[PDB]
Amino acid sequence: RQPIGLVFTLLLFGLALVACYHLLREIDPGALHDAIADVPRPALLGALSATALGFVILLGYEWSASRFAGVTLPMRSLATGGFSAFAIGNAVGLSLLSGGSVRYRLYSRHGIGAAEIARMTLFASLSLGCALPVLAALAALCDLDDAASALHLPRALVAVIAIAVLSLAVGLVAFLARHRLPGERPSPDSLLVRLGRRSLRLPGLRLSLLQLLITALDVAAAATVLYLLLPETPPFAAFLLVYLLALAAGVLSHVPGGVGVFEAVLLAAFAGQLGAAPLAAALLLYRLIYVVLPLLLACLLLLFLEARRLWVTRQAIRVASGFAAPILAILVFLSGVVLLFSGATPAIDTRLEHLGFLIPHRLIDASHLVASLIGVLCLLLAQGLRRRLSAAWALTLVLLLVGALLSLLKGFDWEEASLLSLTAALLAMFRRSFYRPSRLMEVPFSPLYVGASICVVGASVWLLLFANQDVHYSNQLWWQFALDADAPRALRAALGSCLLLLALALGWLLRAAPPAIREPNAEELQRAARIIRHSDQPDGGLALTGDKALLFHESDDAFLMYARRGRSMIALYDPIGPAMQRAELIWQFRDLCDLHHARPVFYQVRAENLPFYMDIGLTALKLGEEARVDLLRFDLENKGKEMKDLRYTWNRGQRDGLALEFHEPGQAPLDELKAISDAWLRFTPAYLNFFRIAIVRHQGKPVAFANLLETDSRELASLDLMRVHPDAPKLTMEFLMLGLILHYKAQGHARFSLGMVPLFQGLRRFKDKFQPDWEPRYLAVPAGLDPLVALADTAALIA
Amino acid sequence: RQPIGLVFTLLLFGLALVACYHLLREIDPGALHDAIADVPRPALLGALSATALGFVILLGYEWSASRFAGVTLPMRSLATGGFSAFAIGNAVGLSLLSGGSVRYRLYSRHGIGAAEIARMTLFASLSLGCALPVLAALAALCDLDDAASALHLPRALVAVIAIAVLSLAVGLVAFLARHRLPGERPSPDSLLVRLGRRSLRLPGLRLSLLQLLITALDVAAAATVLYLLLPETPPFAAFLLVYLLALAAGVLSHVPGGVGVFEAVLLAAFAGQLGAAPLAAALLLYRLIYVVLPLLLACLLLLFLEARRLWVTRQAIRVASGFAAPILAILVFLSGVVLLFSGATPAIDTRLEHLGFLIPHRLIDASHLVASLIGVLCLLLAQGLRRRLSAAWALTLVLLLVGALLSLLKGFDWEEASLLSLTAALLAMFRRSFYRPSRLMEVPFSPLYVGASICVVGASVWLLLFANQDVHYSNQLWWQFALDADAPRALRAALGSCLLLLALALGWLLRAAPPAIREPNAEELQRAARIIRHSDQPDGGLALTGDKALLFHESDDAFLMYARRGRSMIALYDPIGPAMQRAELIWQFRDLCDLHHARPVFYQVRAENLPFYMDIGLTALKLGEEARVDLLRFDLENKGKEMKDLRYTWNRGQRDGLALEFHEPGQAPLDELKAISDAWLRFTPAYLNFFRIAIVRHQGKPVAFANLLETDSRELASLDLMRVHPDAPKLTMEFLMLGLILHYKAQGHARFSLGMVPLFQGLRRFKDKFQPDWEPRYLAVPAGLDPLVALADTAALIA
Ligand SMILES: CCCCCCCCCCCCCCCCCC(=O)O[C@@H](COC(=O)CCCCCCCCCCCCCCC)COP(=O)(O)OC[C@H](O)CO
Ligand SMILES: CCCCCCCCCCCCCCCCCC(=O)O[C@@H](COC(=O)CCCCCCCCCCCCCCC)COP(=O)(O)OC[C@H](O)CO
Ligand SMILES: CCCCCCCCCCCCCCCCCC(=O)O[C@@H](COC(=O)CCCCCCCCCCCCCCC)COP(=O)(O)OC[C@H](O)CO
């Protein structure tokens, strides 16, 4: 899907650029500049106002999603999440940070579930998507003649299509209303409908109406931003209709911004009626104001909140896995876009004239080319930044400063230089955000990032051909080094960019194959065992089974056991070591899964590492609850119903003649354990002789055994393998672990772990007999929240 | 001394600047520029060659010092130390990194003693100093008429003075040769002479001659650098004579470079004969070529070796305390000098003309002023860099980049911008070098750094008055903002610099008084005890006496006990904690001693921290040797004469009826210990009840006791207080500690410490009875290696 999807995305973008070139054949870059200058200042204020209103409406859009999801959030939190998710989501789309990914980060702080947020994301997306046909049909149904003239279709055709769409909408509404199950309601404003296979959660009448009213205002507001920037305007009905169709086309095309396809359609519709230059100026300004501007504001706002959090909560925040890294990848990617577009466009004659006297003329040429190569590097380095490489941080920050300098030496492009500097200043402030010391050369290949770069370089060649159309091409142009020669400086830069990008991408893709997964050897198992001993987490003992691969840190103070099943790679617990080592190992595991084209899954993780799992792009799903008794507050002279039941079990066990013995590793009765294991029925001598075995006996004869996970410290201790005979008494087992607890209380262990119950009722009650302290255990899995998949699933179930 | 010395240094510099202004009254900056352009290219090559020869001679100068000191070093090491120490020493003098400080750092790697190096430094300095009168006299004695005409003195006078100097030199040589003690010789090429009070170590005849021949060539070579840059030249005899006198005056004046006083004297001598412009051009070029150039080369070379060491030895080097920090302080200080001098000098009319079209004219003014303030900040921040503040690193690196930018916006000063950029690029490479996270606002006041800044700002106003002499001053000049107005841009900058410098210096000096030293409270003692437990070093137990101040880290994972005696502040051991915590605490202690105007002394330190003590500017003196027995290789079934003597002592002790008992803290027989302490004669219950006490008894009655320093780990354990009765057997004590060793061997301790012997013979033998492992213990003290003090001491002893 990914490769095909990405290819058909690039084609669409490419075809759209061709379309835009043909539609602006009769216009020169002069006429565009004049058209941009022409639009009055009241119109720009009108646009900016309409933009502000149109982004306030999206907050209410976010509120409705929370009501649907049954999520209570503070107003300031909904506001921020509404704005940032819609502002970044609309701009960069899927390429970099998406709407869902923003929502999830932001709304994980308040303890909103991963399921809820997903259901908030889906509702935010689908509600526009599914309203867009209805809104369009209605728009066309006012003044059909104008709509017909705009689309250049027969009046009868567009009439029946609109009617058909409305009728189908009504028929669908009536159908899903038919299967409305009464009684139960997930949220105040929701329904649960049934179709036979799956239950489906739909908004209520009131919420559906309200959402449609919000969607209506939002569209209108957005279309109005464009409508005000047009000197001469068509009837608004037809103009809205077209805008909605262009918007649809942009969405379907899966082009990040909608860029190219949107413009192409608008241009197509109103090529002749309005004229190219006014429309093309309006479309550019519309993009800057309604798309780029709120993105920058959102980016800044999120960086600001990050910076604040670092300033106030200095102690709490340690490893830094927040918003700075994605946001700064975006800004650095935009910085590379600026550099590349700047180069394609010719310079101001006045500036070149004067800068010719300050600089050697042949250095202008050199500066111009180098700036364009740095631009390409900036596009690719954006990935490295996203993955929190310190190398990437340093190299970027150098290239931005050199790029800002060569911006001044090129054509005194002080606007480009100012943007690049400002990006550098931001990137600098967040040095600690990029904390991984991995090599840049070991970043896994990302088709998306390569696809994006190719698009940008494509756009820049489109701009080159448009901006330098006044010159007659010739073979000699390539070798002209003058000052007045602006076209040759474009050409050479263009070729340089394309070649470097091609080279890097080939040098990235044609790389050595990654080594195969192998079970650990004796040395590794011994090194794992060492780490486990000099650590807190005893659950790490399962590593020493030697049936699952071990991934070691560079410092070799930490490791992370995992195993490949099907197309996924399941890690068994959190990494084993300090917080920084844990963060580096989680990133290492992402890297390792990306190199093997496998889905990174983490099994049974604690809540303390959930932000790091968020960082590499996983969602925490509530797997099960792990019960662990506290030995500090546990005493055998206390009172309680369950405590009295336990003391009864204990004393009855002692009177019966049950005895408990502890054997250190190496001196275990292997013959007995084998016989017991066989009677019950991994169990290997190598695995068993790593741990201390507690054996309980009934009147001398061994009645059960259990190996004990334990570290050199006394913070925690667990049990993994534990088998009892069918013929053994029922209270013997309960006596056993009670004996284990007593022994650990004598040794002065802080805590003791029993185990995890998933979702079992009998096991849950049995654990609850000791009155333990519960703690949630999560599962980490990738975030598969594609609107299209969900809509296709809904449509399939409905049909 | 320091304040007086610094004041009389500034006065001399000031008076010299006045002198230089008066001597260049008849010359304009035009005539100087022409004179600089005039000097031919063969002459510059001749100068550069003579410089290279004159720095090769200094290597042989360094060799002779090693022979005198009796130090064997590799040729490449002598070379580097010769060059760097003479190149930096000559340039910056005493202000920043000095010759001795370079030698000590460089020659500590090879395990050259602190005493040796000091003796190498003194010999390197004094040999020139004491040869300069002889060389001068001899020079004057060739062609007396020319020498008389140059000095404008009578021929008879200069004749008798020269003769007197030579006669006194011969008479001194004969006198010190009289008291030449035969037999013993510290080195092959040395003598030991006696005068009654102190023994004095002088070079041999052969070494004295050779040194004089080296000194002769070196001077000649240096004078020749200047002689070639003169179009019209006086007789070389007289020219040399003057150069030596000017050199003397420069040295005596204690002006860092010799700058001002040297030029003043040369100028004075050859004002009229040669003409101002040629001479003043020669003197400037001489400074650049023979002083500034080798300094930059040395700086680069030392940075290169640092960079290499970081690249190759990544694992070994951890905390980074080498050459980068001092060297980069110098470069940053020079960067501030460039900015300040650039501002005082008017701009090129051509560049302003063209840059007027690219920039707003009133932004040139703003850029010009801001650049001059950044210059001043750069001068002061140089200190912060030296003390390895990360804040200083970040702030500098920002100011250098902004300063480089405003250099371009000012008058397109692309040379200033290039230097500043290059400094920034270097500073960036060594980010890790500046690792302390202290506040900038808490740096202690350094009069020297303030004095240096005032000199620079003084020089810049001297340059302002010289470079802008063509304009008529008026009150209105201050308020003229034009483009062609270069003098007002100087004035405003000058005033701004002076005011900012004054303000900062007052804001630095008038600061709150530092809190007084107080003994620790119960909480601190308890927190110290905690640290000691969770650590390796048990010697830290002496902290819990509570008679000595404790200095804690910010993390509170480390501390450093110290006590004030007289005018010094003695720390008792190394800091207690990790390597990074140790480095930060040592710097903290330097800071604390600088705020109380006390000499930082470290007592009984290990060799592992010696580089950090080097960093804050201490010299390791061999205090004593600490013996610690290794329990891994120690066994009671081994063979050996001493081992058989120990086993005999043990079994005889057991048969006699000696018994050893171990009491945990809290359950000590206080009554007994008190009685034993009284019988022997800090001893307090609070101090005693922190440690486990081992009590040996003779037939039941307690015969001795000894508290045991110990941590939670088993890496090491010691004994501090240990008293025995006069009437107790002689072998009872030896049995006691043997019992202690046996007990620690049973507990599985890695090592065990006995104690330190200073320089005692009986104690040394007693320790050697157990066949221990010796390890040197050092004392850290400031480096008081002022040539003048040593010469005054020598002169006083001779007389
Ligand atoms: C009309 C002319 C206008 C001139 C411009 C005037 C205004 C300039 C204002 C610039 C201020 C922005 C720079 C702030 C960056 C944050 C500093 C920082 O933290 O830097 C980090 C990175 O280190 C740096 O030094 C980075 C320097 C890069 C800064 C780049 C931005 C300045 C750009 C200036 C113009 C450059 C030239 C462009 C045109 C060619 C170090 O972080 P740390 O955590 O390691 O250390 C913190 C320390 O412990 C204290 O707590
Ligand atoms: C034309 C619209 C209709 C058809 C659309 C379909 C075809 C798409 C392909 C082309 C789309 C973009 C074309 C126009 C974009 C701007 C062109 C432009 O002017 O580019 C300038 C440079 O390129 C841009 O400005 C690109 C703008 C787009 C992206 C901007 C992102 C902003 C953020 C960047 C990172 C900074 C982050 C820190 C800030 C918080 C260079 O030209 P200049 O002559 O104006 O500049 C020279 C001199 O400096 C001043 O005159
Ligand atoms: C004719 C035009 C010529 C144009 C110039 C062309 C040549 C430019 C070459 C510049 C290269 C020098 C910069 C190298 C600096 C070392 C990078 C570095 O390590 O930076 C540290 C500081 O971080 C930075 O990003 C500092 C950036 C500052 C660099 C400043 C020098 C460049 C100046 C360019 C011109 C600026 C404009 C001047 C005029 C206004 C980060 O160290 P770290 O240990 O934290 O990270 C290491 C990582 O883990 C990998 O192992």
Ligand SMILES: CCCCCCCCCCCCCCCCCC(=O)O[C@@H](COC(=O)CCCCCCCCCCCCCCC)COP(=O)(O)OC[C@H](O)CO
């Ligand atoms: C005059 C000599 C006899 C009398 C001496 C007694 C009086 C002493 C007081 C003055 C001493 C210095 C006077 C002359 C120094 C240089 C003057 C000069 O030219 O200054 C320029 C700037 O100042 C300097 O160059 C100062 C040089 C001295 C210190 C240099 C240190 C070098 C290292 C700096 C740090 C960089 C580190 C990285 C490199 C490895 C600005 O003038 P400009 O018109 O030449 O420049 C404008 C334009 O850019 C090009 O024309």
